[PDB]
Design a protein around this motif. Structure first.
Motif, PDB file in Angstrom:
ATOM      1  N   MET A   1       9.169  -4.013   0.174  1.00  0.00           N
ATOM      2  CA  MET A   1       9.378  -4.163  -1.252  1.00  0.00           C
ATOM      3  C   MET A   1       8.187  -3.615  -2.027  1.00  0.00           C
ATOM      4  O   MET A   1       8.328  -3.107  -3.135  1.00  0.00           O
ATOM      5  CB  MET A   1       9.653  -5.629  -1.604  1.00  0.00           C
ATOM      6  CG  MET A   1      11.085  -6.032  -1.273  1.00  0.00           C
ATOM      7  SD  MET A   1      11.575  -7.624  -1.931  1.00  0.00           S
ATOM      8  CE  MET A   1      10.893  -8.778  -0.593  1.00  0.00           C
ATOM      9  N   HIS A   2       7.014  -3.708  -1.424  1.00  0.00           N
ATOM     10  CA  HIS A   2       5.808  -3.186  -2.026  1.00  0.00           C
ATOM     11  C   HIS A   2       5.974  -1.663  -2.161  1.00  0.00           C
ATOM     12  O   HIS A   2       5.657  -1.074  -3.199  1.00  0.00           O
ATOM     13  CB  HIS A   2       4.608  -3.503  -1.135  1.00  0.00           C
ATOM     14  CG  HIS A   2       3.357  -2.808  -1.557  1.00  0.00           C
ATOM     15  ND1 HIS A   2       2.434  -3.387  -2.397  1.00  0.00           N
ATOM     16  CD2 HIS A   2       2.916  -1.552  -1.317  1.00  0.00           C
ATOM     17  CE1 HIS A   2       1.477  -2.517  -2.658  1.00  0.00           C
ATOM     18  NE2 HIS A   2       1.745  -1.397  -2.016  1.00  0.00           N
ATOM     19  N   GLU A   3       6.473  -1.031  -1.105  1.00  0.00           N
ATOM     20  CA  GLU A   3       6.681   0.408  -1.133  1.00  0.00           C
ATOM     21  C   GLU A   3       7.799   0.766  -2.120  1.00  0.00           C
ATOM     22  O   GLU A   3       7.755   1.819  -2.757  1.00  0.00           O
ATOM     23  CB  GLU A   3       7.044   0.918   0.253  1.00  0.00           C
ATOM     24  CG  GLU A   3       5.979   0.728   1.303  1.00  0.00           C
ATOM     25  CD  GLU A   3       4.677   1.430   0.961  1.00  0.00           C
ATOM     26  OE1 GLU A   3       4.721   2.542   0.388  1.00  0.00           O
ATOM     27  OE2 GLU A   3       3.601   0.872   1.283  1.00  0.00           O
TER      28      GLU A   3
ATOM     29  N   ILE B   1       8.391  -0.710  -4.869  1.00  0.00           N
ATOM     30  CA  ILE B   1       7.901  -0.772  -6.229  1.00  0.00           C
ATOM     31  C   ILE B   1       7.323   0.620  -6.548  1.00  0.00           C
ATOM     32  O   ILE B   1       7.605   1.195  -7.601  1.00  0.00           O
ATOM     33  CB  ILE B   1       6.864  -1.899  -6.377  1.00  0.00           C
ATOM     34  CG1 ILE B   1       7.586  -3.246  -6.250  1.00  0.00           C
ATOM     35  CG2 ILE B   1       6.144  -1.786  -7.709  1.00  0.00           C
ATOM     36  CD1 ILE B   1       6.678  -4.463  -6.230  1.00  0.00           C
ATOM     37  N   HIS B   2       6.545   1.175  -5.620  1.00  0.00           N
ATOM     38  CA  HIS B   2       6.004   2.515  -5.819  1.00  0.00           C
ATOM     39  C   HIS B   2       7.177   3.452  -6.079  1.00  0.00           C
ATOM     40  O   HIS B   2       7.133   4.287  -6.979  1.00  0.00           O
ATOM     41  CB  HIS B   2       5.259   3.008  -4.577  1.00  0.00           C
ATOM     42  CG  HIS B   2       3.866   2.488  -4.457  1.00  0.00           C
ATOM     43  ND1 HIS B   2       2.996   2.436  -5.529  1.00  0.00           N
ATOM     44  CD2 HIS B   2       3.166   2.051  -3.385  1.00  0.00           C
ATOM     45  CE1 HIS B   2       1.822   1.991  -5.120  1.00  0.00           C
ATOM     46  NE2 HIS B   2       1.899   1.751  -3.822  1.00  0.00           N
ATOM     47  N   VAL B   3       8.223   3.300  -5.271  1.00  0.00           N
ATOM     48  CA  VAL B   3       9.423   4.110  -5.387  1.00  0.00           C
ATOM     49  C   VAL B   3      10.054   3.957  -6.774  1.00  0.00           C
ATOM     50  O   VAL B   3      10.475   4.938  -7.394  1.00  0.00           O
ATOM     51  CB  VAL B   3      10.446   3.724  -4.287  1.00  0.00           C
ATOM     52  CG1 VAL B   3      11.792   4.369  -4.566  1.00  0.00           C
ATOM     53  CG2 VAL B   3       9.923   4.177  -2.929  1.00  0.00           C
TER      54      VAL B   3
ATOM     55  N   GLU C   1      -1.885   2.456 -11.003  1.00  0.00           N
ATOM     56  CA  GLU C   1      -0.505   2.214 -10.590  1.00  0.00           C
ATOM     57  C   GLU C   1      -0.503   1.451  -9.251  1.00  0.00           C
ATOM     58  O   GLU C   1       0.407   0.681  -8.953  1.00  0.00           O
ATOM     59  CB  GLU C   1       0.235   3.559 -10.486  1.00  0.00           C
ATOM     60  CG  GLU C   1       1.738   3.489 -10.233  1.00  0.00           C
ATOM     61  CD  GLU C   1       2.086   3.383  -8.756  1.00  0.00           C
ATOM     62  OE1 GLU C   1       1.337   3.942  -7.914  1.00  0.00           O
ATOM     63  OE2 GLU C   1       3.121   2.761  -8.438  1.00  0.00           O
ATOM     64  N   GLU C   2      -1.551   1.661  -8.470  1.00  0.00           N
ATOM     65  CA  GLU C   2      -1.725   1.020  -7.173  1.00  0.00           C
ATOM     66  C   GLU C   2      -2.102  -0.445  -7.349  1.00  0.00           C
ATOM     67  O   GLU C   2      -1.616  -1.317  -6.645  1.00  0.00           O
ATOM     68  CB  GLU C   2      -2.826   1.747  -6.408  1.00  0.00           C
ATOM     69  CG  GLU C   2      -3.327   1.046  -5.172  1.00  0.00           C
ATOM     70  CD  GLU C   2      -2.402   1.212  -3.986  1.00  0.00           C
ATOM     71  OE1 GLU C   2      -2.077   2.376  -3.646  1.00  0.00           O
ATOM     72  OE2 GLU C   2      -2.006   0.179  -3.394  1.00  0.00           O
ATOM     73  N   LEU C   3      -2.980  -0.720  -8.297  1.00  0.00           N
ATOM     74  CA  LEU C   3      -3.396  -2.086  -8.528  1.00  0.00           C
ATOM     75  C   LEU C   3      -2.318  -2.843  -9.290  1.00  0.00           C
ATOM     76  O   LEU C   3      -2.159  -4.044  -9.107  1.00  0.00           O
ATOM     77  CB  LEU C   3      -4.723  -2.109  -9.285  1.00  0.00           C
ATOM     78  CG  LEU C   3      -5.859  -1.351  -8.590  1.00  0.00           C
ATOM     79  CD1 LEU C   3      -7.164  -1.612  -9.326  1.00  0.00           C
ATOM     80  CD2 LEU C   3      -5.984  -1.796  -7.139  1.00  0.00           C
TER      81      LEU C   3
END
Ligand SMILES: [Ca+2]
Ligand SMILES: [Ca+2]
Ligand SMILES: [Zn+2]
Length: 1276
Positions: A228-230, A232-234, A266-268
């Protein structure tokens, strides 16, 4: 809702839901990959991600791809069809777990419907161009073994198996001609390399992974969250809001600094929690504007789009409405597409602050790491995610039926071991820094153990730019949070437009930028002779072969000798540990050394109250030698002097800009449009304050709190190394014994380890509270104040900016210009208090803050103390202290102010400390010793007040003054009105406990009361409600001031100022802390001394004294003579009367439980004070004879202190000998009998014993004595 499809790897291709896809990075050249449509627009390709890598890169080598990751390699993962099917089934189970909850289902939905705009920056506004690698991807329809036919399709996400490093999951966007549609509002096809079995491991230094130094620690991650973390980036990349901006870059100038990649906000944001706080509000807006700007370009494109050349089949109107739904654009009764600001903020905040690893973890009751900036342990392998006995779609590993829910026990490495397997290190790669001495002797250090310190370049200097204020100008703020509850119940966020056909024309323009990767050296060797924390922790380890070791307090010895292990514990602990005994005493020694370990470890709870420090871990310096060589000298002392700052490995250079100037706009004749420009400049001013604080907070977190984190870990490793070493010694000794001996040895290694572990966990809690306190200490006193300085400078420059403006608008502002004039002066009259929860909502951070603020000792803004023959401020605010030659100082913290012009102290307070938060709230405390009036000068004593401490600013301030037997506190509001409270002791008492005797003073001031405390008790209270403002941060002048007689002097000690009203309870405790000593005191309150002449006083018999009877060897009890002179305003009992006693040592300063010889002068001889021995009577006269071994009488005496409360009284007790608890009696005074008025003597007495045990202690006892030396403060 969201449908998760099911298939089997071997199912046949159908060119619809199971295809032979040609991935974007294959550039359409060569083989395809079987892909499975798991949901609309999302595809699964169960094969290794090889784009940009070399086959060999898949093997473990002496290289690494990422510097801050413990990489795992396995070229065999996914190398068979059954492995591919497992990957497929696992992906299906994970997606099912994601949608098992409303929140996750929404994530999937936004992602499925967040279709990429048809085109990118290169595409004309009027067109839709699907023939771009970021929009269309091909599928091979052609028969097997030929590419006769390729059909195009639209897609949103393509998930592959892992790349070379199994545990290095990553989401990739498509870049064409150096640009990225996913970063410019368009969105584009997103790719992901993902591995579900090899998940990361983490643990909290604050928490306790089931607490066990010997058992596995840490928690393993739920792969569904990782996915799900990935996603979100998506999501960000699909909405094209994955914008680049000012990154957080690590400082890499020092060898001890952590080297790592640049981190985008965007990472944080994606991680959430406290991480967004590392991104200043300045940059939060910069990113906000950029995304808003990208959307502006998109909405304009929709208002102009007319055709699609690439695909004749595209229905313009169908798509215009789908994108309008996607971006939440508004459509007027004309067809015009517009951006509704409100709905934009909602969507933006939802995507950036709603969907975050932290918020999802919380909702799914899954445990995750505390921060992006937290140590990355080795990964583990989940045995079988497809086994419902271990992992469920509904609960993950935290299955309640297995009692694995409570406390994420299911993710706990020490608890759910049946869920995973450890990994073969032989297959792990880790970036190491080899630190070599230039002798040499190198130590390999993981780049994870280094200090991560953000460089100054990471932060936004935007605060220095100018601001154009208009009647329109408004306040800009972005809440780095978003109520997760409403995102879940948010109706009109969900897609309200059907998903168009995914079938389109084939892609023929394969133009695209393919990322090329290459491994980099896994070890960098650097030269340094510094012996900091790394070297120190190292000195505490030992080779896996060496089995006969011993502890040593020499760091250097430990470095050199392999069987030598450095220990930062006591010399005692160290010697006992190397002790070798007989088997019959091994058990007793093990029990000793262990319990001792615990004791040493628990010194982490040491208090240093006298020095105004509630908690101190004295051994941290010895354990790590981090900062300014903290292993040398005494750490406690060094800390009392410098504070937290000494622990920092590096002092960061903060960015605190001059806040740009405001340019106001004129609106002549338009009263209002001019008033608004004022009211607005005011509000925009508040914005600059808040933004500056955020700039500080972001810096504190990434440059300071990171270091303290590193120190907490270092200390955890240190305690472990000590426990590990001890056990190694214990085991080694045991195995020296014969099996026959071992059999008769009482040893429980599970008791030992348990106790050792319990001692560490307690130490860790202390160390953590201490370190967090230091962190918050540095923030509030070494960082915030500097921001306050600039903010006041600005606040000022702006004051004379608005006043001028109002001036030039006298004509237009008419009969109110004068009104705003105030408006401006009064609005800028109060500085915004700093509140951490404004910038973060993280539970731990908030608690650290609230705790720091709950400790009264942190309100001390002035603390004058002695250090190398001089006074300095140890509050941490750096007040300027100028001590002139006239002042006398000693190491007992006492200073004397004489009548001399040069006897003064100048203190320039810190101007940036919040003090006058408006309402008056502060206290002042100190010890004072005021001499007795000159018998021949009582007229000037009574009348005549002189100031001793003065603190004024522009005719307003406070003042402590004295008029004889009266000390006075005075307040002066900014006008000139004055209120005062005072304490006054009596000058007609036989024995006064204030005159020339040290006594504690505390003065507190709240909104309407100024109070004065004496020895913790309230003496007087003055209602000061009238009083207006009161300036108090002006200079403080310590000097006797007024019509003072040349012989006038004043002793003062422990001067402190608090920026708050102290409670009666705080005061009384400060009284007790500052009264404590190991030595006893004399009548005046000074330290009691050996070989010093003293007259005796009895707390029981005030007016009674001791004279050696003309006849026999005993002490009479005559009556003190008295004020013979004739002033009716003074009276007292002579104190320098009676015998001249002198204390002698048995086996300098007089301490408690010491054995002495109470002698006294008689003409020229020095006699002693003995007892009889066998007085079967309860009490009886003492014997005063010369210095002889009258074995008929006792001589030795043990001075004690029974009163638990402050007192200058002490007791004198005899003992059969310096050993036998067997007592004899306490020295005092008792009346006997004699009739021709009986006769009281130097009676010793056992009757006391029972009495002393009484509580509350008896002050008026006859065994309570006091010693009085001639003192210049008392003349009779
Ligand atoms: Ca932020
Ligand atoms: Ca060694
Ligand atoms: Zn990430």
């Amino acid at each position: 809702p969201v449908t998760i499809n099911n298939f089997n790897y071997n199912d046949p291709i159908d060119n619809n839901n199971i295809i032979m896809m040609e991935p974007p990075f294959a550039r359409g050249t060569g083989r395809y990959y079987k892909a499975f449509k798991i949901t609309d627009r999302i595809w699964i390709i169960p094969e290794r991600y090889t784009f940009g890598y070399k086959p060999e890169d898949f093997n473990k080598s002496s290289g690494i791809f990422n510097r801050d990751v413990c990489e795992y390699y396995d070229p065999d993962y996914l190398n068979t069809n059954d492995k591919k099917n497992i990957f497929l089934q696992t992906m299906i189970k994970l997606f099912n777990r994601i949608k098992s909850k409303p929140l996750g289902e929404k994530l999937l939905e936004m992602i499925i419907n967040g279709i990429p705009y048809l085109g990118d920056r290169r595409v004309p506004l009027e067109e839709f161009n699907t023939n771009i690698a970021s929009v269309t991807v091909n599928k091979l329809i052609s028969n097997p073994g030929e590419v006769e036919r390729k059909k195009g399709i639209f897609a949103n996400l393509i998930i592959f198996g892992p790349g070379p490093v199994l545990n290095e999951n990553e989401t990739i966007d498509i870049g064409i001609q150096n640009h990225f549609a996913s970063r410019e509002g368009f969105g584009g096809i997103m790719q992901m390399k993902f591995c579900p079995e090899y998940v990361s491991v983490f643990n909290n230094v604050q928490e306790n992974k089931g607490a066990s130094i010997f058992n596995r620690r840490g928690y393993f991650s739920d792969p569904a969250l990782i996915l799900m973390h990935e996603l979100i980036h998506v999501l960000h990349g699909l909405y094209g809001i994955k914008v680049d901006d000012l990154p957080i870059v690590p400082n890499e100038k020092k060898f001890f600094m952590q080297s790592t990649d640049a981190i985008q906000a965007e990472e944080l944001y994606t991680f959430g929690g406290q991480d967004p706080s590392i991104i200043t509000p300045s940059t939060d807006k910069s990113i906000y504007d950029k995304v808003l700007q990208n959307f502006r370009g998109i909405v304009d494109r929709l208002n102009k789009v007319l055709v699609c050349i690439s695909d004749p089949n595209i229905n313009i109107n169908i798509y215009k409405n789908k994108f309008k739904d996607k971006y939440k654009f508004v459509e007027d009764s004309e067809g015009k597409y517009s951006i509704d600001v409100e709905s934009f903020d909602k969507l933006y905040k939802s995507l950036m602050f709603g969907f975050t690893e932290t918020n999802i973890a919380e909702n799914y009751k899954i445990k995750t790491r505390a921060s992006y900036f937290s140590d990355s342990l080795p990964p583990v392998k989940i045995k079988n995610l497809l086994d419902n006995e271990i992992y469920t779609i509904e609960e993950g590993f935290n299955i309640s039926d297995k009692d694995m829910e409570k406390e994420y026990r299911g993710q706990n490495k020490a608890i759910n071991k049946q869920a995973y397997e450890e990994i073969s290190k032989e297959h792990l790669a880790v970036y190491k820094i080899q630190m070599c001495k230039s002798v040499g002797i190198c130590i390999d250090v993981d780049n994870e153990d280094l200090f991560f310190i953000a460089d100054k370049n990471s932060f936004s200097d935007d605060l220095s730019k100018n601001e154009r204020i208009e009647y329109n100008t408004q306040s800009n703020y972005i809440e780095n949070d978003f109520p997760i509850n409403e995102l879940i119940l948010d109706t009109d966020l969900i897609s309200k437009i059907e998903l168009p056909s995914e079938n389109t024309e084939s892609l023929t323009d394969f133009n695209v930028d393919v990322p090329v990767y290459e491994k980099q050296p896994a070890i960098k060797k650097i030269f340094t002779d510094e012996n900091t924390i790394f070297q120190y922790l190292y000195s505490q380890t030992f080779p896996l072969d060496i089995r006969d070791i011993s502890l040593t307090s020499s760091f250097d010895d430990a470095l050199l000798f392999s069987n030598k292990v450095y220990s930062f514990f006591s010399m005692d602990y160290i010697k006992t540990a190397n002790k070798v005994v007989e088997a019959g005493l091994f058990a007793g020694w093990v029990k000793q050394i262990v319990n001792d370990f615990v004791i040493e470890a628990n010194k982490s709870n040491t208090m240093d109250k006298i020095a105004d420090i509630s908690l101190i871990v004295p051994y941290i310096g010895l354990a790590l030698n981090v900062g300014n060589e903290t292993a040398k000298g005494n750490f406690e002392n060094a800390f009392e002097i410098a504070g937290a700052s000494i622990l920092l490995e590096f002092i960061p250079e903060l960015l605190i800009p001059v806040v740009g100037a405001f340019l106001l706009e004129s609106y002549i004749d338009n009263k209002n449009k001019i008033i608004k420009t004022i009211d607005n400049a005011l509000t925009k001013r508040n914005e600059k304050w808040s933004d500056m604080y955020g700039l500080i907070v972001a810096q504190w977190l990434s440059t300071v709190n990171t270091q303290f984190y590193t120190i907490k870990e270092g200390m955890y490793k240190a305690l472990n190394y000590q426990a590990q070493a001890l056990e190694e010694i214990i085991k080694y000794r045991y195995n020296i014994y014969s099996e026959k001996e071992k059999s008769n040895i009482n040893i429980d290694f599970n008791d030992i380890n348990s106790k050792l572990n319990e001692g560490i966990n307690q130490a860790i809690d202390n160390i953590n509270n201490f370190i967090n306190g230091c962190s918050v200490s540095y923030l509030m006193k070494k960082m915030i104040p500097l921001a306050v300085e600039k903010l006041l400078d600005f606040d000022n420059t702006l004051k004379k900016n608005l006043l001028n403006y109002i001036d030039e608008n006298k004509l237009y502002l008419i009969g109110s210009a004068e009104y705003e004039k105030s408006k401006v002066n009064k609005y800028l009259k109060t500085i915004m208090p700093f509140d951490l929860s404004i910038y973060t909502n993280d539970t731990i951070l908030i608690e650290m803050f609230n705790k720091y603020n709950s400790e009264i000792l942190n309100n001390i803004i002035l603390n004058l103390r002695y250090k190398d023959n001089n006074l300095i401020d140890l509050s941490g605010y750096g007040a300027k202290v100028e001590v002139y030659d006239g002042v006398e100082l000693n190491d007992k913290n006492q200073f004397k102010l004489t009548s001399s012009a040069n006897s003064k102290i100048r203190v320039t307070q810190n101007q940036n400390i919040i003090f006058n938060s408006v309402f008056l709230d502060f206290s002042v405390s100190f010890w004072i010793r005021i001499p007795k009036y000159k018998n021949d000068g009582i007229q000037n004593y009574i009348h005549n007040e002189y100031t001793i401490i003065n603190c004024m600013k522009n005719n307003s301030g406070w003042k402590i003054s004295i008029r004889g037997n009266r000390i006075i506190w005075t307040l002066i509001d900014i006008n000139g009105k004055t209120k005062s409270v005072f304490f006054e002791y009596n000058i007609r008492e036989d024995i006064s406990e204030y005159i020339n005797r040290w006594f504690f003073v505390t003065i507190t001031n709240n909104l309407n009361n100024a109070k004065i405390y004496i020895n913790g008790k309230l003496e007087s209270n003055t209602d000061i409600k009238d009083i207006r403002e009161v300036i108090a941060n002006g200079e403080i002048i310590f000097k006797l001031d007024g019509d003072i007689d040349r012989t006038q002097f004043i002793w003062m000690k422990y001067f402190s100022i608090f920026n708050t009203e102290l409670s009666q309870s705080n005061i009384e405790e400060r009284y007790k802390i500052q009264s404590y000593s190991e030595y006893l005191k004399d009548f005046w309150g000074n330290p009691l001394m050996y070989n010093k002449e003293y007259y005796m006083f009895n707390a029981g018999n005030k007016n009674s004294y001791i004279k050696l009877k003309k006849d026999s060897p005993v002490g009479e009890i005559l009556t003190r003579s008295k004020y013979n002179q004739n002033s009716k305003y003074i009276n007292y009992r002579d104190l320098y009367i009676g015998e001249k006693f002198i204390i002698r040592r048995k086996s300098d300063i007089v301490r408690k439980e010491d054995y002495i010889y109470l002698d006294f002068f008689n003409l020229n001889q020095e006699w002693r004070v003995y007892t009889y021995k066998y007085f079967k009577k309860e009490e009886e006269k003492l014997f005063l004879a010369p210095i002889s071994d009258s074995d008929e009488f006792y001589n030795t005496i043990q001075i004690k202190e029974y009163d638990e409360q402050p007192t200058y009284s002490c007791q004198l007790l005899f003992k059969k000998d310096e050993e036998s608890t067997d007592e004899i009696g306490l020295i005092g005074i008792h009346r006997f009998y004699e009739s021709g008025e009986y006769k009281d003597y130097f009676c010793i007495s056992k009757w006391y014993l029972k009495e002393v045990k009484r509580k509350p202690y008896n002050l008026k006892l006859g065994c309570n004595w006091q010693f009085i030396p001639k003192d210049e403060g008392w003349t009779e």
